[PDB]
Amino acid sequence: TRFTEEYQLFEELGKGAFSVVRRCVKVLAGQEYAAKIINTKKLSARDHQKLEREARICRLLKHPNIVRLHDSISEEGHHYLIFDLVTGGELFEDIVAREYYSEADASHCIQQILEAVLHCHQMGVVHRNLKPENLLLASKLKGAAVKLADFGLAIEVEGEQQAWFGFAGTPGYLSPEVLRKDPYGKPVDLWACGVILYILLVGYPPFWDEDQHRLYKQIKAGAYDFPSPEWDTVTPEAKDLINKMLTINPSKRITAAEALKHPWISHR
Amino acid sequence: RNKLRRQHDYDTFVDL
Ligand SMILES: Nc1ncnc2c1ncn2[C@@H]1O[C@H](COP(=O)(O)OP(=O)(O)OP(=O)(O)O)[C@@H](O)[C@H]1O
Ligand SMILES: [Mg+2]
């Protein structure tokens, strides 16, 4: 079929449980991409439908701060996802390496993340799984764009309609409404943006505990600090945006649109 | 302080 004949495979960039990703060239254009090659023979019916939902949802998104899915091909014993080639690794790795971001860099970073989330929301997509591991740097270059990835847990929403879409995501980044088993939607991503922004500024999260029961109590109670000394030098408008994202009532939580107008971002 | 660790995605409620 059309993958082997339209795309030329080059070296392995990474691997997962049931996938290998290789650099490839669309021979006609000579443009390079990342080909995620999935052995569908080793996938359950459930994983197979997850994959085809992920492919559908990601294809809705066309934004410089989202890892673009250009093509989806279902051949003999394989599924090929053709993505933007990204060579800068995870935002998680960059934060670890640099300890934390200056307010300038943190503001620049979360602005890009909010633009990606806003685009998702305008396309009727809620990610549900925002975290530093799911944000990739386009390159190792100085001012490389942050790109949102992994729509494996993303859902399609009907305008502003909320519903119970199930208990799904990463414990440390789960919104209070999901933990409360409340109907939810777009606001869940803005909670995760708050957790990410907090991490960018001091290099550690607002909610953590070895005991998951106690972690979920902290999140539901919205019990987070700005400890001294590291937060003492952090500007109050930075703390204000975090506070406006980490509100336990999603109806009172700042949206992606409103967040991008917030002084700390719009005056930077 | 709180630990910055890699965390895994769950598709359902799994009580840890
Ligand atoms: N767009 C990309 N450009 C370059 N390398 C990539 C790209 N996407 C993924 N990789 C590399 O391939 C590795 C595995 O990719 P990915 O995480 O998508 O596979 P997986 O673990 O099988 O999938 P999933 O995370 O959905 O379980 C990544 O850790 C990374 O090193
Ligand atoms: Mg992976």
What type of residue sits at position A113?
I
Cβ burial, residue A60 (10 Å; 0-12/13-18/19+): middle
Report the distance separating Cα A150 and Cα B8, nearest Å.
12
Q: What is the largest CA-CA distance in chain A?
A: 60
Tell me which residue of A195, A200, A203, A87 sits closest to A147, measured CA to CA: A87
Q: Cβ of A171 and B9 within 8 Å?
A: no
Report the distance separating Cα A183 and Cα A50, nearest Å.
22
Q: A152 contacts in B (CB within 8 Å)?
A: 9
Report the distance separating Cα A131 and Cα A114, nearest Å.
13
* Beta strands, E only, A56-162: 69-75, 78-83, 125-126, 135-137, 146-148, 155-156
Instruction: Report the b/e string of A9-41 with b at 16+ CB within 10 A.
Output: eeeebeeeeebbbbbbbeeeeeeebbbbbbebe
Count of CA atoms in the C-beta half-sphere (13 A) of A33: 26
The two tokens of residue A87 are 């060579």
What are the pocket residues of ligand 1 if the criterion is a CB atom closer than 6 Å to any ligand atom? Answer: A 13-14, 16-19, 21, 34, 36, 67, 83-86, 150, 152
Q: A203 contacts in B (CB within 8 Å)?
A: 4
Q: B4 contacts in A (CB within 8 Å)?
A: 95-96, 199, 203-205
Dist. CA A150 → ligand 2 center (Å): 8
Cβ burial, residue A239 (10 Å; 0-12/13-18/19+): middle
Contact between A107 and A115 (Cβ < 8 Å): no
The two tokens of residue A215 are 């972690």
3-state secondary structure of A194: helix
Resolution (A): 2.1
Report the distance separating Cα A62 and Cα A84, nearest Å.
11
- 3-state helix, strand, coil split of chain B in percent (to 5) is 0, 5, 95
Phi-psi region of A181 (alpha: psi -120 to 50; beta: other; left: phi over 0): left
Contact between A153 and A120 (Cβ < 8 Å): no
Tell me which residue of A36, A42, A14 sits closest to A24, measured CA to CA: A36
In this complex, the residue of B4, B11, B16 whose CB is nearest that of residue A204 is: B4
Tell me which residue of A56, A77, A74 sits closest to A3, measured CA to CA: A74
3-state secondary structure of A36: strand
Residue B2: how many other CB atoms lie within 10 Å? 19
Dist. CA A15 → ligand 1 center (Å): 6
DSSP class of residue A130?
-
A21, A44, A92, best to mutate for ligand 1 pocket (most atoms within 8 Å of CB): A21
Report the distance separating Cα A199 and Cα A206, nearest Å.
8
Tell me which residue of A204, A191, A197 sits closest to A238, measured CA to CA: A197
The distance from CA A66 to its chain's CA centroid, rounded to whole angstroms, is 9
- Ligand 1 atom nearest the C-alpha of A21 is 12
Contact between A248 and A222 (Cβ < 8 Å): yes
Report the distance separating Cα A13 and Cα A76, nearest Å.
23
